[PDB]
Each structure stands twice: as C-alpha cells, then as structure tokens.
Design a protein around this ligand. Structure first.
Ligand SMILES: COC(=O)N[C@@H](C)C(=O)N[C@@H](Cc1ccccc1)[C@@H](O)C[C@H](Cc1ccccc1)NC(=O)O[C@H]1CO[C@H]2OCC[C@H]21
Lengths: 99, 99
C-alpha cells in the first residue's frame, strides 16, 4: 500500500504466532521489539538510539509477517519504548520512501 | 524522488542558510537537529527515543528545504547523534511509504 505520515505508521505484525502493533521506521537500521517470549537461540547485544544504549536479545532468522508481507531476519528484543520495524526488514518487503 | 532503504536515507537539507545531511525518519514524530545556533526565541523540551531522553531547544516556524521541497514547522535542536527529519515536516513534502 501507500502510507501517509499524518499519523504514526503503525501496522500489525505477526511474530512467533502472536499479533503485535509496530512502527514502520526508516530511521532505524534494526528491528527492535518490546520484551516477549520468542523461541530459539539468542545472543546478548546492545543497541544505541537517541537517548543512549539498551541491552537486547538478538534473534536471528526469525519469521515476521508485516501487513501480510513475509520477512525472515534479525529481531532484537528488549526494553524499547515502542516496537520498531527497521530497514533490515523494510527492505525485504520492498518498502521505499516517495515524495 | 524514490529513496530505497538499503542504506540510511540521508538527504541534504537547507536550514538557517546552512546545508546539512539529515535522515528521513518515519519513526520520529518531530524533527531533531544537531547543535546549531538558530536565532530567535525557543522553548525547552525533552524528547525520548531508545535509551532515554535528551534536552532540546524547540524553535517554531522554521523553514527547511529538503531535496528542493520546502517545509515550515517546529525544529528541535540538541545533542542528537544524527540530524533527523520527522513526520511533522515529511508530511509537508508529500512523503509516503510504499510497499
Ligand atoms: C516520539 O518519539 C520520537 O519521535 N523519537 C524520535 C526522536 C526517535 O528516537 N525515533 C526512533 C524510533 C523511536 C524510538 C523510541 C520511541 C519512539 C520512536 C527512530 O525513528 C530514529 C532513531 C534515529 C537515530 C539513528 C542513529 C543513532 C541514534 C538515533 N533511530 C533509532 O533509534 O534506531 C536504533 C534501532 O536501529 C538502530 O539504527 C539507528 C539507531 C538504532
């Protein structure tokens, strides 16, 4: 679809079989979700943003469905204030900015 | 134009008579620029991202040219690691996400 930016670009995602709301964020390199129980191995990692760094769990090769488009890639899980879909998965679903 | 998301979506902006590089960021409500001395009145504000909050100076009705498209709105100035163009100005240049 085509999404304007008058409101936050929130979409429903499906991950680990659960539905969540997440923000489509072109300013994020990486995808970061709030604390949740995901199956599989994970590695400790740190990620930095506007206010500093947080500790996250890095899950590799995770299936995530974003408005019906499938992606398989890295998901970081940790104490982010908002669920963020970053460029690592926006590219897989063919997302571009247009103006 | 059309901007893909393989790399950070950095563009040249013109503000306060100066040229800068900034990130087009659908995940930001507001526009936040690195420390710069802008003339006029301002209001204190705090803005939050991953990792916490930073203190910024809020300037109103600032003109910014983004790849030749003009926008006028609120600009926050403070110790951000990167210049961020947020939805308050992306809507004015007619920017959409498409997939
Ligand atoms: C209403 O609150 C706001 O609008 N807040 C605005 C200011 C804000 O912070 N928005 C972020 C999403 C967001 C986070 C928390 C709450 C609401 C929204 C992103 O849109 C922009 C940042 C920009 C940035 C790039 C490089 C280095 C530092 C900062 N990107 C980011 O934090 O990305 C992380 C994940 O991926 C990695 O890549 C870059 C850094 C890492």
């Amino acid at each position: 679809p085509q999404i304007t930016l008058w409101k936050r670009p929130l979409v429903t995602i499906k991950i680990g079989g659960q539905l969540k709301e997440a923000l489509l964020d072109t300013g994020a390199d990486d995808t970061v979700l709030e604390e949740m129980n995901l199956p599989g191995r994970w590695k400790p990692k740190m990620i930095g943003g506007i206010g500093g760094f947080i500790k996250v769990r890095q899950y590799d090769q995770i299936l995530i469905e974003i408005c019906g488009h499938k992606a398989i890639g890295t998901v970081l899980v940790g104490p982010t204030p908002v669920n963020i879909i970053g460029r690592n998965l926006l590219t897989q679903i063919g997302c571009t900015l247009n103006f």
